[PDB]
Design a binder for this molecule. Sequence first.
Ligand SMILES: Cc1cc2nc3c(=O)[nH]c(=O)nc-3n(C[C@H](O)[C@H](O)[C@H](O)COP(=O)(O)O)c2cc1C
Length: 159
Amino acid sequence: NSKILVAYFSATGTTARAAEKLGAAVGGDLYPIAPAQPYTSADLDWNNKRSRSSVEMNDPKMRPAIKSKKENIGTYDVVFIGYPIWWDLAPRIINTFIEGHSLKGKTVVPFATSGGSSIGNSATVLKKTYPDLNWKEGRLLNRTDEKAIRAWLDVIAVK
Ligand SMILES: Cc1cc2nc3c(=O)[nH]c(=O)nc-3n(C[C@H](O)[C@H](O)[C@H](O)COP(=O)(O)O)c2cc1C
C-alpha cells in the first residue's frame, strides 16, 4: 500500500478536524501547512475588501509564506491537500505549498471544508494551474466518517 500524507491548511480548525479524520482512516501522516504569519479574525473578514484574505484572493500570484516545508515529502506516494474554501477557491497558501514541494509522480487529491460551496470550482482551478500533476477527484468533508472516506477512496482507486 501507499505511503500517504495528509497536508492541510486550516485557519479556524474545521479543515484540521477533517484532515485528522482522513489521516486516521487511511493511516496517513498529517502535515499542517503553517503560515509564517498566522491569520487573525480580522484577516479572515470576507466583508472587508481590505482584509488580508480579500487582498489574497484578488491576487492570484500571491504566495503566503509557509513556516516549514515537509522535509521527507519525497517518500510519499499519495498526498491529500486540504483547505477551507475561500471565495470558491483554494487559499493561496495552497499554491505556496504545491510550488515549494515536488509532487511529480505522486497521486494528488484535494479535500475541503466550506460554508456550503462545493469543492468543484477550487479543484478545477488547481488542476488547471498545475496540470502536470496526477490529480484525482476530491471531496468536501464537512460531514464525514470512515465509511464515507473508504467509499470515496475506492471510487478514485487510492489505497
Ligand atoms: C475568507 C473566507 C472566504 C470564504 N469563502 C467561502 C466560500 O466561497 N464558500 C463557502 O461555502 N464558504 C466560504 N468560507 C467559509 C469556510 O470555507 C469554512 O468556514 C471552512 O470550514 C473554514 O475552515 P477552517 O476552520 O479550516 O479555516 C469562507 C471563509 C473565509 C474566512
